[PDB]
């Protein structure tokens, strides 16, 4: 056992290195797309459905990001504790949390709790790619849009019942020792203004700012989901390294 856990710790150290590399390789695209979104928003009307807060919100879609392998110490436990706290907060605000899950551990935890899971994705929490993030963000954004026409508990003209908010619970990787489960409202986005930077030479927009903003907001959502998945993978590897160090020391 000591041999197995020591091997697992060394493998986890290598995997932490790789996950940090991946987290760093996605930073430039995130920065550029954020800047492009800032420009388009500055040169557009801020009325996109994703930006406007629904009146009488009553359903929030919470995406809980857990792992697949269970050798992490308290990674999944902390993530699920934060998810439960967020559920309590949503209940306080009179919102029914519909649930999406990433990773098998959270699937099992919620199955034991008899909490219905609208959808789940598994098998990539160790090394998530952008395709997985795109699929998850597509599903979440489709649900949020379907929540636009819903009234009372009726799907409305959509034919499908949606959500009025989107949250992501995931483990943010502060450092090699600090990994904190955090909840983050991904939609609707809080439009906040900043001082004048830039606008002396206006950007030209092809075809026009509104179409680009509509095409780019979902991409920003998917980019943020991808960043969350990468941070979750790094945190999972860090916590697995710590757990295997503890196990090998104990063994």
């Amino acid at each position: 056992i000591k041999k197995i856990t020591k091997a697992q710790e060394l493998i986890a150290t290598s995997r932490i290195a790789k996950a940090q590399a991946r987290v760093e390789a996605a930073r430039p695209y995130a920065a550029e797309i954020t800047n492009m979104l800032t420009e388009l928003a500055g040169a557009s009307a801020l009325d996109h459905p994703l930006l406007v807060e629904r009146k009488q919100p009553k359903r929030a879609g919470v995406l809980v990001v857990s792992s697949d392998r269970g050798l992490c110490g308290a990674y999944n436990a902390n993530v699920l504790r934060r998810a439960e706290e967020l559920f309590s907060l949503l209940r306080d605000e009179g919102k029914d949390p519909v649930l999406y899950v990433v990773g098998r551990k959270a699937l099992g935890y919620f199955s034991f709790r008899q909490r219905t899971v609208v959808e789940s994705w598994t098998g990539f929490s160790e090394r998530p790619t952008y395709e997985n993030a795109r699929e998850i963000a597509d599903t979440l954004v489709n649900a949020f849009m379907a929540g636009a026409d819903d009234e009372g508990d009726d799907a409305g003209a959509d034919g499908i019942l949606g959500v009025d908010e989107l949250h992501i619970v995931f483990t943010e990787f502060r450092s090699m020792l600090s990994q904190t489960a955090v909840a983050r409202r991904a939609a609707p986005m809080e439009v906040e203004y900043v001082g004048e930077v830039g606008p002396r030479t206006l950007y030209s927009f092809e075809p026009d700012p509104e179409t680009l903003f509509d095409a780019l907001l979902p991409r920003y959502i998917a980019t943020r989901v991808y960043a969350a998945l990468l941070e979750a993978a790094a945190s999972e590897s860090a916590s697995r390294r710590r757990a295997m160090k503890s196990a090998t020391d104990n063994a």
Binding site: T34, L37, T38, E39, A41, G42, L46, L51, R81, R82, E84, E85, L86, F87, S88, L89, R91, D92, H167, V182, A183, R184, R185, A186, A187, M189, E190, V191, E192, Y193, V194, G195, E196, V197, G198, P199, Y220, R224
Partner: peptide, 21 residues
């Protein structure tokens, strides 16, 4: 379960380079 502090819930935002309206 003790619910989230509403301030502890990070909010995704779209930065706009304009003065507040």
């Amino acid at each position: 379960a003790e619910a989230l502090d509403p301030e502890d819930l990070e909010k995704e935002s779209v930065k706009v380079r304009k003065p507040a309206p």
